[PDB]
Design a protein around this ligand. Structure first.
Ligand SMILES: CCCCC/C=C\C/C=C\CCCCCCCC(=O)O[C@H](COC(=O)CCCCCCCCCCCCCCC)COP(=O)([O-])OCC[N+](C)(C)C
Ligand SMILES: CCCCC/C=C\C/C=C\CCCCCCCC(=O)O[C@H](COC(=O)CCCCCCCCCCCCCCC)COP(=O)([O-])OCC[N+](C)(C)C
Ligand SMILES: CCCCC/C=C\C/C=C\CCCCCCCC(=O)O[C@H](COC(=O)CCCCCCCCCCCCCCC)COP(=O)([O-])OCC[N+](C)(C)C
Ligand SMILES: C=C(C)CCCC(=C)CCCC(=C)CCCC(=C)CCCC(=C)CCCC(=C)CCCC(=C)CCC[C@@H](C)CCOP(=O)(O)O
Ligand SMILES: *[C@@H]1O[C@H](CO)[C@@H](O)[C@H](O)[C@H]1NC(C)=O
Ligand SMILES: *[C@@H]1O[C@H](CO)[C@@H](O)[C@H](O)[C@H]1NC(C)=O
Lengths: 690, 731
């Protein structure tokens, strides 16, 4: 009618207004860098200086922190330490205003989310005051984080997901393609802010597999229409979230182009392309005798060619030739002529350029041994021989002859000869015929814990372990542009490598870390800043009216799918009309599956997990609690005393999350006192809050 | 053999009843004389094949040193620690002592010949006897699963011929009693399938599933995966009992509660009883209980754990701290210097009692008083032998040197001449992990558990499970760490003595290990070794390399003979070929089902897909959690899952005979007789790799089909004649 349209207009701006109030009320009061504002603020400052970095998370969160800084009149010149005060030019009020505007847009998007998943009108209000009035969201929405952005594109992912579900009855319409492409864009932004956005794509992917499954059984659907469904779902649910992800790494690579911290996580050609370039040389590439080089492995894990002065305890008592991964004068190498010829002299006049396919003797500079494989096998891998260093310019054998073979050229110069950084080369022995390789495995402590170097007889030419490149040249030129897809793969493998390096040791007590069972039931919270009486002090935990009742609603619904499934097998006809099945499935079931996908990887994985990882998982738990208020009180809409009991039960629990948000309002709004004033909301132990 | 489906019309859709008649019980048991004659014939053939040439490898074989030596430990009574639950080692101790075995032979390393005092051929007879009975349990399991008589006979003869079970069951190993009790669990549960689930025969089958299932779970922890598999099949069967409408709800809860009671009560009861026989028979204390708590060791006989130490400790007492969490712990300092840091006197964890574990409690500031150790009383730990304090200068750690936390602690100082504030240690009693009473306030030996905070750096005294190889070998590291784990930070005092206390002092001793704490502590060491059992082994395999039978494990090499575990590859590759073909045909029956065509018309195809979802699910639950393990594992961990693979392959041969060749069963029996004939041919060619019987080298080269499996092929001679005129060495 008219009153429902009136609440439909004036009510989203009341919840939007209480979202802007709830998330922006004491933004500029703490006056110090906080929990991960020190990290993600710094990463946002890397874009404003256009300096390269490496970090675990995908860039669209950090690019939105850079866009959060460009709107603040800030040039990135201040790195973000932990704990320190702000300089007066860094207007952090616009940045915290920006992220708290993302959570303050996460609230009305939950309003229209709950409007889309059925939900008779008091349920939309309880779910909007439920996502709105919460100290976990308004605590972690207050700051320079990409948890507000992960939460925002998770809510836009579920919202555009149900708005895609609501036009399944008229497929291939304008609304169908609209919310399918908006679901693709929001899912792609959900990965590209943080890599745990694969969880919502597991949920929408399970919905898509269930749709294509039930579209196999429709008798009227032709095969042309069904193949149009497959191309529509792989396009708008696979290609578009991958095109947004690739576009985010295109703005990541093409935006920042200088050097910075964490530049060493790249292949040396991409590091040579960027502006800083402490790995490149202008005029000349390589020559014979005078070119002092350091050979680098292009394998993921290989390092510089090293030769320390200790000799082999297991071998032919020659000098150890291993691989080490830092700058050293023992990593210096050069080239000498083959066996039978007079060697290099320091008073030559012709600067000979090196020729591939020609045998040479690779001589270490600071020590003076010839690169050689000798008839003692490798110590760890007993399949192949062992690489050593023997003799000088005249003492040795015919096995000292090592050829140079071109494997790949990056153009912009002569491809016939060996070069620096533009010539990936394999090295093969002449008499034996083994290719110089590197397994990457670790040696025992006799070789000072360095890399194992093997010389395999027949590896393949598609092997990355045999590919070496020249990095240093020691006695007008631009390096070519690298392949963008290859840099995408190498940078995602470096991100996954830092994820594997993020696994904690069990001996160090990380005070801030938590386990996933503590995030519901609120066993522990999270201390975001310094707990002195000077600064206002924040604390991450949910409002215990929302997430206790919400967690017990996930337990009460996860044993409602089972009860309705047992009663389904017992031939009961549970959900009669398509309306209440629509509210069960979209309002109830896919939030149980999105809760499970957003939560159960955090209880399975071996990684440092904190309280702020439950914020996307808590949202679907709050949808589940909204459903347990929706369908659980649907039968009370028919009796008058049941109707009045229904509205005072909705108003009772809504007043409970109002009063329990306001009672715990100091732990998001500041706790400006001396931290002993706030022991009244220290309800349990392990809530280290006072 | 199998009846037609009895489907009935519910109020919405048709439902299938789950109450078999007594006819289904009579069709699938040994009701005739010909079937008992062929079970007796398969028992003769199996008892010849599984027990041929026994005690011909008359030396210890791979991991026969382990479970044989542990059987010797149960005979001698000296306590030991192994990864596994006790029943299939204590059971070899009962077979051994039943055969006249009195310890007396440490099973040291592979190749040690048995003396003529140890019964090994009787233990080998027990292991290969249970490995023979699992064949007859595969026949009866298969017939109870609903299977033609002759195809169960030829599939079970095909299982007696399987090389991997003859090797794994012939020797003193763990997978032969384990495989017997898993096979008896699926035996008794498939016997429970065919009974109407209310009668007394069905509850006898649940009780036999309980004692066999939990007697598998108590022999090796992969039996817990058979508990999981049986439980998922209980979700299957209770799901279809919900689907049955003629069954009342009280009947479904009676089958569910009695199913839960016989199938989780009786496994947990038998598991606890077998650990009670473990703790009750293994009473002596040896070097095996060297990494157990001193309250654990207080139950054991002939202890060196100190009893009746002085409870109330005072300032001026020669004491000895012991680390709580890491079992190898004492504060230990002796006259050897570090290789790094400041190269002062080292502070280590030495697990045994010395005089170098002794420390004085002296104040920062020896009177005639008894100033108690209150909470926050800063003291200086004065080592009484080498005349030094405990000093925590901020230098590099010895072996955990990559540590921004974990500050290094040492021992340096002169009594009366070099005493500074950096030798202080504030005693902070943890009031939670200490027992209540007087010990919660002040320091009582054995009863409180305090934490030594350094008074000038704010860091706590810390240790963990990393030793020191430089000097004082096999001794761990003492550090002074901030933000280290609160579990690894606790210290307590034992073996204290001061002159300023009378001889009528209230002593204290340990609370000696109530059976629940004994059980839980033993399982924390089970899980602790089992998770951290990382050794570089040359025959170690990878779980995705098991179903293709590449690179099997080796067992024994002596006197121009070898034993090597590679399975019957023409049964192995047909098992996993049937995992692939059954996955493909169940995908094409899902898509062909929903796409419009009707699937599952004939009842034999229905019981085929039902029992191969059952058996394939047994393959899934015994093989997929071996991917979820960060430890080493060999080819014989696939083998419980491979038992369900050969059951499902049994049903594959049944669907070749019984459905796809209904009109011409001579071709179905022709396919099964060529498969069985090729299987027995693979056994006959690979018999000299099982029994340690002689090959020739020109055929040993030809037998290596894949180059992946490699068993020292130059060990054999060039002809079989040279073995008769040959003497053999004995180690
Ligand atoms: C403080 C707030 C806590 C949140 C609320 C907590 C619990 C309540 C949760 C759910 C209530 C039911 C809402 C979904 C039902 C929709 C299906 C439906 O409605 O079908 C119901 C039948 O299903 C059921 O009875 C089964 C649900 C009952 C099981 C839930 C309790 C499980 C155990 C709870 C334990 C909780 C604590 C555990 C952890 C400590 C009837 O249908 O036909 O009539 O249909 C209407 C069609 N006409 C209109 C044509 C007639
Ligand atoms: C996916 C892994 C799941 C693993 C766990 C599985 C189940 C445990 C979860 C919940 C168990 C509660 C089930 C109550 C169902 C009420 C349905 C109903 O109320 O209807 C009952 C049906 O009786 C049943 O079938 C109940 C079967 C119970 C199954 C076995 C229960 C497990 C035993 C306890 C195990 C531990 C449980 C707690 C675990 C946390 C009344 O039907 P009727 O015959 O009177 O009317 C005839 C129908 N006409 C009128 C249409 C014809
Ligand atoms: C079939 C429906 C019945 C219901 C039961 C359900 C499933 C039963 C079926 C198979 C058992 C599932 C076990 C895998 C579960 C974990 C998945 C996993 O992870 O392993 C997968 C693959 O594993 C397998 O090779 C599956 C083997 C299944 C048996 C053989 C299948 C037939 C294939 C040969 C067909 C021959 C030709 C046919 C025509 C003649 C990869 O391993 P990964 O990723 O960990 O390697 C990473 C290791 N790093 C971390 C160290 C790098
Ligand atoms: C409830 C109903 C409705 C019906 C009742 C149905 C029912 C009977 C049960 C309800 C259905 C149900 C879901 C049960 C859950 C199963 C249950 C009780 C418990 C979970 C069991 C588990 C799967 C896991 C936890 C245990 C572990 C400690 C597993 C670690 C494993 C190992 C590391 C083994 C190592 C041994 C070997 C591999 C290596 C050494 O090998 P070597 O010899 O040295 O080389
Ligand atoms: C960045 O802003 C600060 C703040 O005034 C200023 O001092 C500095 O010069 C600026 N740097 C650049 C490169 O603009
Ligand atoms: C030290 O404190 C304990 C705590 O009750 C007390 O029993 C003991 O008598 C005290 N020591 C002396 C010498 O009073």
């Amino acid at each position: 009618s008219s009153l429902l349209r009136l609440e439909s207009v004036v009510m989203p701006v009341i919840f939007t207004a209480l979202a802007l109030f709830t998330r922006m009320y004491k933004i500029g009061i703490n006056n110090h860098v906080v929990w991960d504002e020190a990290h993600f603020g710094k990463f946002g400052s890397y874009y404003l200086r256009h300096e390269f970095y490496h970090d675990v998370h995908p860039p669209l969160g950090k690019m939105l922190v850079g866009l959060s800084g460009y709107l603040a009149g800030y040039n990135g010149s201040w790195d973000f330490p932990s704990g320190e005060i702000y300089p007066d030019y860094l207007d952090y009020v616009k940045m915290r205003l920006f992220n708290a505007s993302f959570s303050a847009l996460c609230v009305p998007l939950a309003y229209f989310t709950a409007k889309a998943i059925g939900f008779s009108l008091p349920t939309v209000w309880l779910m909007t005051v439920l996502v709105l009035f919460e100290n976990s969201y308004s605590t972690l929405g207050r700051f320079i984080l990409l948890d507000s952005m992960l939460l925002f594109f998770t809510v836009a992912s579920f919202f555009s997901f149900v708005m895609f579900h609501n036009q399944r009855s008229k497929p291939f319409s304008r609304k169908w393609w609209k919310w399918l492409l908006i679901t693709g864009i929001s899912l792609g932004c959900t990965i590209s802010v943080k890599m745990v956005g694969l969880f919502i794509i597991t949920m929408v992917g399970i919905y898509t597999v269930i749709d294509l499954w039930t579209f196999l059984a429709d008798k009227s659907m032709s095969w042309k229409t069904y193949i149009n469904h497959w191309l529509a779902r792989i396009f708008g649910l696979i290609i578009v979230p991958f095109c947004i992800f690739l576009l985010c790494f295109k703005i990541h690579f093409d935006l920042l182009s200088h050097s910075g911290t964490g530049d060493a996580n790249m292949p040396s050609l991409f590091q040579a392309r960027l502006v800083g370039s402490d790995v490149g040389q202008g005029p000349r590439d390589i020559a014979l005798g005078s070119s002092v080089v350091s050979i680098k492995n292009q394998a993921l894990g290989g390092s510089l060619l090293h030769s320390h002065i200790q000799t082999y305890p297991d071998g032919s008592n020659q000098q150890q030739v291993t691989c080490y991964g830092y700058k050293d004068a023992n990593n210096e190498w050069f080239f000498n002529r083959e066996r039978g010829l007079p060697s290099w002299s320091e008073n030559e006049t012709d600067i000979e350029y090196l020729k591939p396919g020609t045998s040479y003797r690779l001589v270490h500079k600071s020590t003076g041994r010839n690169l050689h494989t000798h008839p003692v096998a490798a110590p760890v891998s007993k399949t192949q021989w062992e690489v050593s260093g023997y003799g000088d310019n005249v003492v040795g054998d015919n096995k000292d002859n090592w050829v140079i073979e071109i494997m790949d050229q990056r153009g912009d110069e002569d491809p016939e000869k060996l070069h620096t950084l533009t010539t990936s080369f394999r090295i093969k022995n002449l008499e034996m015929g083994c290719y110089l390789a590197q397994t990457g495995n670790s040696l025992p402590e006799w070789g000072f814990r360095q890399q194992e170097v093997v010389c395999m007889k027949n590896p393949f030419k598609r092997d990355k372990r045999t590919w070496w490149n020249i990095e240093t040249h020691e006695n007008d030129f631009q390096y070519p542009k690298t392949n963008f897809l290859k840099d995408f793969i190498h940078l995602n493998l470096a991100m996954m490598a830092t994820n594997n390096a993020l696994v904690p040791d069990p001996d160090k007590f990380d005070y801030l870390a938590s386990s996933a069972w503590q995030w519901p039931t609120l066993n522990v919270g999270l201390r975001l800043c310094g707990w002195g009486d000077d600064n206002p002090k924040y604390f991450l935990l949910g409002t215990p009216a929302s997430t206790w009742a919400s967690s017990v609603a996930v337990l009460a619904f996860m044993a409602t799918v089972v009860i309705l499934l047992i009663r389904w097998q017992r031939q009961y006809v549970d959900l009669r009309n398509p309306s209440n099945w629509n509210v069960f499935l979209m309002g109830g079931f896919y939030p149980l599956l999105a809760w499970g996908l957003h939560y159960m990887p955090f209880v399975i994985m071996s990684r440092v997990t904190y309280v702020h990882h439950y914020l996307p998982a808590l949202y679907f738990a709050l949808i589940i609690l909204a459903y347990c208020f929706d369908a659980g009180l649907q039968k009370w809409s028919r009796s008058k005393c049941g109707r009045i009991m229904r509205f005072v039960l909705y108003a009772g629990f809504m007043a409970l999350v109002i009063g329990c948000f306001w009672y715990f309002s100091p732990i998001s709004f500041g706790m400006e006192g001396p931290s002993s004033n706030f022991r009244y909301l220290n309800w349990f132990s392990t809530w280290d809050i006072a | 053999p199998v009846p037609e489906l009895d489907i009935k019309q519910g109020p919405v859709r048709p439902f299938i009843v789950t109450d078999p008649s007594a006819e289904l019980a009579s069709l699938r048991t040994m009701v005739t004389l010909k079937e008992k004659l062929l079970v007796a014939c398969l028992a003769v053939f199996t008892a010849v094949i599984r027990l041929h040439g026994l005690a011909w490898p008359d030396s210890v074989v791979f991991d026969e040193v382990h479970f044989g030596g542990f059987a010797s430990q149960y005979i001698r009574g000296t306590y030991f620690m192994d990864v596994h639950p006790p029943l299939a080692k204590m059971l070899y101790a009962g077979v051994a002592s039943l055969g006249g075995f009195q310890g007396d032979f440490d099973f040291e390393n592979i190749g040690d010949s048995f003396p003529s005092t140890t019964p090994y051929v009787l233990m080998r007879f027990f292991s290969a006897s249970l490995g023979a009975l699992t064949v007859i349990l595969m026949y009866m399991t298969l017939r109870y699963s609903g299977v033609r008589m002759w195809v169960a006979l030829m599939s079970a003869i095909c299982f007696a011929v399987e090389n991997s079970y003859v090797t794994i069951s012939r020797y003193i190993l763990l997978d032969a009693p384990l495989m017997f009790f898993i096979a008896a669990a699926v035996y008794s549960f498939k016997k429970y399938e065919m009974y109407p689930a209310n009668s007394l025969n069905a509850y006898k089958s649940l009780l036999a599933t309980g004692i066999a299932l939990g007697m598998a779970s108590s022999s090796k922890w992969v039996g817990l995966f058979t508990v999981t598999w049986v439980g998922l099949l209980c979700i299957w069967r209770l799901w279809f009992m919900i689907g049955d409408l003629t069954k009342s709800s009280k009947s479904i809860f009676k089958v569910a509660f009695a199913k839960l009671a016989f199938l989780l009560g009786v496994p947990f009861a038998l598991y606890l009883v077998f650990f009670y026989i473990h703790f009750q028979s293994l009473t002596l204390d040896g070097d095996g209980a060297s990494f157990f708590s001193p309250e654990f060791r207080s139950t054991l006989k002939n202890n060196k754990i100190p009893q009746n130490v002085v409870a109330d400790v005072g300032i001026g007492s020669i004491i000895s701290l012991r680390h709580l969490s890491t079992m190898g712990g004492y504060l230990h300092s002796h006259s050897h210097n570090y290789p790094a840091g400041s190269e002062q006197q080292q502070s280590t964890l030495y697990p045994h009692m010395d005089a170098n574990n002794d420390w004085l409690l002296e104040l920062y500031n020896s009177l005639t008083t008894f100033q108690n150790l209150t909470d926050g009383t800063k003291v200086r730990l004065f080592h009484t032998v080498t005349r030094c304090r405990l000093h925590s200068h901020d230098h590099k750690p010895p072996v955990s040197e990559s540590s921004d936390w974990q500050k290094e602690v040492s021992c340096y100082g002169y009594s009366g001449f070099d005493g500074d504030a950096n030798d202080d240690w504030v005693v902070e009693i943890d009031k939670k992990n200490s027992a209540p009473g007087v010990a919660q306030e002040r320091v009582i030996a054995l009863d409180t558990k305090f934490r030594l905070r350094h008074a000038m750096t704010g860091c706590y005294l810390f240790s963990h499970e990393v030793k020191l190889p430089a000097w004082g070998f096999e001794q761990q590291e003492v550090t002074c760490a901030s933000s280290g784990r609160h579990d690894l930070t606790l210290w307590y005092v034992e073996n204290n003595s001061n002159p300023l206390l009378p001889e009528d002092t209230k002593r204290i001793s340990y609370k000696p290990a109530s059976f629940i704490s004994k059980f839980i502590e033993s399982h924390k060491k089970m899980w602790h070794i089992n998770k951290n059992l990382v050794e570089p082994h040359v025959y170690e395999s990878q779980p995705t390399s098991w179903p293709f039978l590449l690179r099997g494990i080796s067992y024994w090499g002596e006197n121009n003979r070898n034993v090597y575990l590679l399975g019957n590859a023409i049964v192995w590759w047909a098992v996993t070929a049937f995992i692939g073909i059954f996955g493909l045909i169940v995908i094409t029956e899902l898509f062909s089902w929903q796409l419009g065509k009707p699937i599952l018309k004939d009842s034999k195809v229905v019981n085929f897909h039902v029992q191969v979802i059952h058996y394939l699910l047994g393959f899934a639950v015994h093989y997929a959690p071996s991917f979820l393990m960060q430890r080493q594992m060999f080819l014989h961990h696939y083998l419980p899952a491979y038992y369900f693979g050969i059951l499902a392959l049994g049903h594959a041969l049944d669907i070749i005979v019984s459905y796809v060749f209904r009109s011409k069963r001579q071709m179905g029996y022709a396919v099964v007789i060529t498969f069985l004939a090729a299987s027995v041919y693979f056994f006959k060619s690979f018999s000299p790799i099982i029994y340690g019987t002689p090959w020739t080298q020109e055929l040993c080269q030809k037998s290596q089909w894949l180059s992946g499996w490699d068993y020292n092929c130059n060990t054999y001679f060039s002809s079989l004649e040279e073995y008769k005129n040959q003497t053999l060495t004995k180690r």
